[PDB]
Each structure stands twice: as structure tokens, then as C-alpha cells.
Amino acid sequence: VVCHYDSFPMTADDKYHIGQTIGGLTAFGLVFW
Amino acid sequence: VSPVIATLLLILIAVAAAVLLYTWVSGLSANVAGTQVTGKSLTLIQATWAR
Amino acid sequence: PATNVGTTISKDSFDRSKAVLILSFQPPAQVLQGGQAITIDAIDVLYQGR
Amino acid sequence: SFDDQYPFATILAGTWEVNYVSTNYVETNFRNTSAVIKFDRFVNTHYSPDTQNNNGVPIFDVASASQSNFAVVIWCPNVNPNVMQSVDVKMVFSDGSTWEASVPLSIT
Amino acid sequence: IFDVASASQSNFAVVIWCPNVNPNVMQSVDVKMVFSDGSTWEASVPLSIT
Amino acid sequence: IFDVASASQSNFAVVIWCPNVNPNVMQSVDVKMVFSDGSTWEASVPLSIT
Amino acid sequence: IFDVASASQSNFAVVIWCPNVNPNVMQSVDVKMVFSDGSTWEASVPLSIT
Numbered sequence: 001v002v003c004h005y006d007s008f009p010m011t012a013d014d015k016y017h018i019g020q021t022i023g024g025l026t027a028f029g030l031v032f033w
Numbered sequence: 034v035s036p037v038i039a040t041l042l043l044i045l046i047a048v049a050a051a052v053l054l055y056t057w058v059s060g061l062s063a064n065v066a067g068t069q070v071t072g073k074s075l076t077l078i079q080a081t082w083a084r
Numbered sequence: 085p086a087t088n089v090g091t092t093i094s095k096d097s098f099d100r101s102k103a104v105l106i107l108s109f110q111p112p113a114q115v116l117q118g119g120q121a122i123t124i125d126a127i128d129v130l131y132q133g134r
Numbered sequence: 135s136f137d138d139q140y141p142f143a144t145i146l147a148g149t150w151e152v153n154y155v156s157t158n159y160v161e162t163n164f165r166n167t168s169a170v171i172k173f174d175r176f177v178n179t180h181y182s183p184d185t186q187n188n189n190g191v192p193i194f195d196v197a198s199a200s201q202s203n204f205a206v207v208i209w210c211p212n213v214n215p216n217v218m219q220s221v222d223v224k225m226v227f228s229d230g231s232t233w234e235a236s237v238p239l240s241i242t
Numbered sequence: 243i244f245d246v247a248s249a250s251q252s253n254f255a256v257v258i259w260c261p262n263v264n265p266n267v268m269q270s271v272d273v274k275m276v277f278s279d280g281s282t283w284e285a286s287v288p289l290s291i292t
Numbered sequence: 293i294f295d296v297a298s299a300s301q302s303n304f305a306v307v308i309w310c311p312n313v314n315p316n317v318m319q320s321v322d323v324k325m326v327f328s329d330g331s332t333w334e335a336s337v338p339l340s341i342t
Numbered sequence: 343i344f345d346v347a348s349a350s351q352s353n354f355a356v357v358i359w360c361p362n363v364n365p366n367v368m369q370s371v372d373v374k375m376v377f378s379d380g381s382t383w384e385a386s387v388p389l390s391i392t
Contacts, residue, residue: 006168007244105221131218
């Protein structure tokens with residue numbers, strides 16, 4: 001095993017969690033151009 | 034008249050406990066979650082990489 | 085493993101013909117009635133069934 | 135800090151990674167996994183205790199884990215890779231059931 | 243950061259970033275996914291330029 | 293406000309409001325009912341979005 | 343200080359403080375109540391962290 005990922009960062013394309021405040025910081029996702 | 038009164042109270046007690054067993058048993062049942070079976074493996078449309 | 089430790093470590097501070105075992109386990113969350121927490125009272129190492 | 139007279143096992147939340155610098159040399163990193171770890175009980179004793187500074191490691195009879203990944207570290211001085219092809223590990227649960235896994239030892 | 247990610251009908255991609263992977267010395271790599279139910283799935287990815 | 297609530301034949305719902313429950317950190321919750329006779333009943337409710 | 347304590351309909355708690363109980367060495371404890379009529383009742387309480 002080179003590396004292991006058990007969790008993931010929130011993605012930009014997620015309407016449910018995009019306009020919320022979690023743990024004191026608003027939510028922003030990831031974007032690819 | 035001791036036996037007559039004693040027997041009556043004993044009959045009532047056993048009836049009450051039996052009905053309580055029923056509620057507990059039936060509530061115990063239909064209380065299992067289980068799982069879903071993941072679909073067949075996803076077909077690979079492409080595998081690639083960039084800098 | 086390294087049994088010889090100074091205030092700084094060289095590559096020769098690590099021993100040869102010695103071994104430490106590592107294991108990674110992933111419990112599955114949704115099992116039947118399965119419990120949230122897994123407990124272990126005893127761990128054993130076997131070789132040739134002994 | 136490792137002594138052949140004091141073998142031990144324990145539960146830690148993480149995974150092991152191997153990185154190759156060259157054909158026969160490697161670099162190794164141990165990472166956190168965000169999992170829970172608790173200890174069931176304490177049995178009188180201690181690990182590598184310092185009487186002067188009150189330093190020591192409590193020993194408990196039961197170890198527990200939670201959701202997500204976790205590792206097991208085992209140290210038995212009697213195991214020799216040059217003469218043993220493979221070894222096996224067995225875990226005994228609190229309820230009495232058991233589980234076993236297989237680990238190759240051969241270089242490759 | 244969330245522990246579990248889910249998807250639905252139609253196509254979807256997976257983006258993986260591991261700094262340890264070097265194309266000049268590795269012919270190919272492999273990826274493994276672990277499901278919530280505990281089952282697993284694996285795919286094969288060539289790395290060689292061509 | 294009354295100490296005991298009763299129902300009859302056909303369907304009925306239960307509305308529960310506890311400010312302490314947070315969907316973002318709790319995977320699921322559970323509810324327990326205590327009868328007048330002393331017996332009990334429990335049900336399971338997922339909270340996860342999906 | 344009174345020798346007898348009484349309760350009525352609905353919920354109620356019992357608060358017990360014994361300095362001799364140590365969570366680090368005791369897996370669990372037990373409580374026993376003695377009624378005015380002489381009958382007895384007992385309950386079980388885990389102490390282990392979890």
C-alpha cells in the first residue's frame with residue numbers, strides 16, 4: 001500500500017452541504033477546470 | 034378459607050406475566066436491520082492521468 | 085525494530101533478524117445487529133498450529 | 135526503546151505506508167485514521183516505569199475499537215523471518231467468539 | 243471532511259492524489275475500494291506514457 | 293399538559309422535537325416508548341441524508 | 343435526616359455517593375433497595391467507560 005484514504009473532502013457539486021456552516025466555517029467544495 | 038383466596042391471587046399473577054411476555058416477544062421481533070447488496074461492479078469507462 | 089536508540093538515529097540503529105507485525109482492519113458498519121464497538125481480551129501468535 | 139525481555143501487543147488508530155527511494159531502499163510513514171480507542175480494564179503492573187519521575191504505562195485486560203480503520207502492533211522476539219515462511223494471528227473476543235488472519239513473512 | 247461518499251445512476255469519476263507515485267519508475271498502479279457493507283472492488287490503471 | 297396519551301384503531305404519528313440532535317454528526321437515533329402497564333417498545337430511525 | 347423516603351407517580355432518580363468506588367479497577371457495581379414491607383429489589387449498573 002502506497003497510501004490509504006479513509007475519509008474524503010466535500011465536493012463542490014453537492015447542493016445539500018454547499019450552503020451550510022459546519023464547525024464554524026461555511027462550506028466550500030472542490031473545483032476542477 | 035385460606036386456600037380459596039390464595040389460589041385466586043396466584044391465577045391473576047400468572048395471567049399478567051404471560052401477556053407481558055407476548056408484548057416483549059413481538060416487539061423483539063421485526064427489530065432486525067440487515068443490509069443491502071451492492072450492485073455488480075461498475076464498468077470501467079476509462080482510466081487515465083495528467084500532471 | 086530498533087532496540088539501539090541514541091539522541092539521533094542512524095540507519096544502523098535498526099536491527100536485523102528481528103520483526104514487528106502490523107495489521108490493518110476495517111469493520112463494516114451495517115452488519116446485521118452487529119455492535120458498534122469490538123473488544124479483544126486475548127491476542128495470539130501461532131506457527132505450525134502451536 | 136525495544137527490549138527482548140518485554141514482548142507486547144496493542145491497538146493504535148492508523149495505517150502503514152511504504153515508499154521506495156531506490157530499488158532496495160525504502161522510507162516509511164505511519165498515519166492517523168480518525169478512529170476511536172478505549173481501554174476496558176487495568177490489572178496491577180506497569181510498563182517501563184520510572185520511579186523517580188512517576189512515569190509509567192498502565193496495563194488493561196481489555197482493548198476496544200470503533201468505526202473506521204485501526205492497526206494492531208505485535209512484538210514477539212521468538213519469530214525469525216529467515217526460518218519461518220509465515221505466521222498466524224488469533225483474536226479472542228469478550229463474548230468468546232474468535233477470529234483469525236494470515237500474514238506472510240517471506241521477503242518476497 | 244466526511245467518512246462516507248455515495249453516488250447514484252449515471253457516470254461519475256474518482257480523483258486521486260498521492261505524491262509518492264512516480265511515473266518514471268512505476269509501470270502501473272492499482273486502486274481498491276472498500277464498501278460500507280464490507281465487500282471490495284478493484285481496477286487496473288496503466289501509468290506508462292505509451 | 294397531560295401525563296398520559298392514548299390512541300385507537302388506524303394510523304397515527306408521533307412528533308418529536310429535541311434541539312440536541314444534530315444530523316451532520318449523528319448517523320442514526322433511536323426512540324423508546326414506555327407503556328402504562330410497564331412493558332416497552334423500540335423502533336429505529338436513520339438520520340443520514342441518504 | 344429522615345429514616346424513610348417515599349415517591350409517587352411518574353419518573354424519579356436516585357443519587358448515590360460512595361467514595362470507596364473506583365472506576366479504574368471495578369468493571370461494574372450493583373444496587374439494592376429494601377422496602378418498608380421487607381421485600382427487596384435490585385438493579386445493575388455498568389461502570390466501564392465503554
